[PDB]
């Protein structure tokens, strides 16, 4: 029956659909000396609040050496503040990767057996990254171009440390966000896609033995 | 050239008028005997948005640590996360209100900088009124989308009693986050983004030489 394929076929997508909500919440199963995606993306976060403190503490020592002689002191803050900008979105690049090869080892997974499947599913998850990455970065970029708005030492150290707090939990905050849950939630809306044109059915179930 | 002279008083008018906008930008305006400077203005109201955060906060703490009371006399994870979400999409509009509040006191402040650099140029008078108000949509516009969007990331997260710590270390953390971030989206778009649009669609006035004598009517 057309309406056999049609379930089997729900069925292929939904079990797919539910491993990547376990990645995006943190659950899915794992090995005995494997990782879980979700620590593998704290611990580049506590990489990025190590940035962050090696670039406050040289802020603090080159700023000093400056004021042993006003908005030439401040250029030097706020270009402190720039030069995490890179590293930032360096980072937006990192965390997208390690999240593409989960999302593509949950397709080979559930789709190993089904070669049509596996290829489109990894075409979706190519598609969805250029473009949650092109809008992660974005929004990384807005956020450093708004941190540039701020005796006077403590002034200046005072908005140093601000800013350094602000990067340190947003950056993270944003590649979450884009690079995580609307990735998942994006590449699940995709696949579901496929019910639509019910003449591709057959193709997307083709099996091994006979391709 | 009287060409040159009128062109030079055009331009002496206009920078007038960006300089006293960057006053108001740099909070550095000058202020009637017992007023307070826009800049400060801004200040209590983000003095007072981090009352509400904190008082929002608590809220949430009280009713949180009472369902695990009511219940104790994780399968109910999903319904205390839902009160942890709950406490933080209610600040959501209290944040685009806030925008609004706002907005509307730098669109005043940049009306006043108008009337008093050209109230004896009605022409330049308006068309410094249409772009300040053009702006002021636009701007808003980008404003509430950046907060909007603000809230729905924040809702992802990051014994009864580990629970507990957790679900509020996550509204304590985002909290610190929306206290500190929606002030810093509005004055970015409603003060210096506002201002420094402004100013340059001023300077464009400069374009059409024929125009000048419009502007500077002064009947």
Do not use: C
């Amino acid at each position: 029956d057309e309406n056999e394929k049609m379930f089997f076929l729900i069925d292929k997508v939904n079990a797919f659909n539910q491993d990547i909500t376990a990645l995006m919440q943190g659950e899915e199963t794992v090995g005995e000396e494997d990782i879980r995606l979700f620590t593998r993306l704290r611990h580049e976060f506590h990489k990025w609040s190590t940035i962050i403190e090696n670039n406050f503490q040289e802020g603090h020592k080159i700023l000093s050496r400056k004021i042993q002689k006003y908005r030439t002191f401040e250029t030097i803050v706020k270009q402190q503040i720039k030069a995490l900008e890179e590293p930032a979105v360096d980072m937006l690049h990192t965390v997208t990767d390690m999240v593409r090869l989960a999302f593509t080892d949950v397709s080979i997974k559930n789709f190993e057996e089904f070669f049509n499947l596996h290829r489109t599913a990894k075409s979706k998850i190519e598609d969805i990254r250029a473009e949650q990455e092109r809008e992660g970065e974005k929004l990384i970029r807005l956020h450093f171009q708004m941190e540039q708005i701020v005796e006077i030492f403590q002034h200046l150290m005072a908005y140093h440390q601000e800013a350094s707090k602000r990067i340190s939990s947003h950056i993270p905050l944003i590649i979450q966000f884009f690079m995580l849950q609307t990735y998942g939630q994006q590449l699940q809306k995709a696949m579901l896609q496929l019910l639509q044109d019910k003449d591709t059915y057959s193709w997307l179930l083709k099996e091994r033995s006979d391709t």
